[PDB]
Write a protein that binds this ligand. Structure first.
Ligand SMILES: CO[C@@H]1O[C@@H](C(=O)O)[C@@H](O[C@H]2O[C@H](CO)[C@@H](O)[C@H](OS(=O)(=O)O)[C@H]2NS(=O)(=O)O)[C@H](O)[C@H]1OS(=O)(=O)O
Length: 132
């Protein structure tokens, strides 16, 4: 990924229903289709080669996957906030937990997050297009 991918804030558009990933100041995570929603502007940070954290800019919190597969957002970049970022077949990205290595960040067609343990590499739910 080129430097601009990290420098410019992104909205993460999920292929599964067209929901943008939304991170809230209370720690909640969900999805919304409205592009002007104030809590869908995210910052991708290169933590290591191929590894990112995902910060909700307004929320001032980082996306975390918990040990039971839930998505929340933390004030600090804990070990639950590191994700392998990978490019898939139609140029959407996936985000796989560095801690729970079989589980992906994902949104259901209902607009709520999909439990990590119910995700998989071939699901539409795990595909996100970073948009400006
Ligand atoms: C092609 O897109 C995937 O498959 C869709 C589908 O099978 O209709 C759709 O899946 C959602 O609806 C189906 C049918 O009701 C559910 O079986 C599925 O739940 S499940 O994955 O837990 O079994 C449900 N997936 S969800 O939206 O992620 O909750 C969906 O557009 C795509 O599903 S996928 O799992 O993201 O690939």
């Amino acid at each position: 990924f080129p430097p601009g991918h990290f420098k410019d804030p992104k909205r993460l558009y999920c292929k599964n229903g067209g929901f943008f990933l939304r991170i809230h100041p209370d720690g909640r995570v969900d999805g919304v289709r409205e592009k002007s929603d104030p809590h869908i502007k995210l910052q991708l940070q290169a933590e290591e080669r191929g590894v990112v954290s995902i910060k909700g800019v307004s929320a001032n919190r980082y996306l975390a996957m918990k040990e039971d597969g839930r998505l929340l957002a933390s004030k600090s970049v804990t070990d639950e906030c590191f994700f392998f970022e990978r490019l898939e077949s139609n140029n959407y990205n996936t985000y796989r937990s560095r801690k729970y290595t079989s589980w992906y960040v994902a949104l259901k067609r209902t607009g709520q997050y999909k439990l990590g343990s119910k995700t998989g590499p071939g699901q539409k739910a795990i595909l996100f297009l970073p948009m400006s």
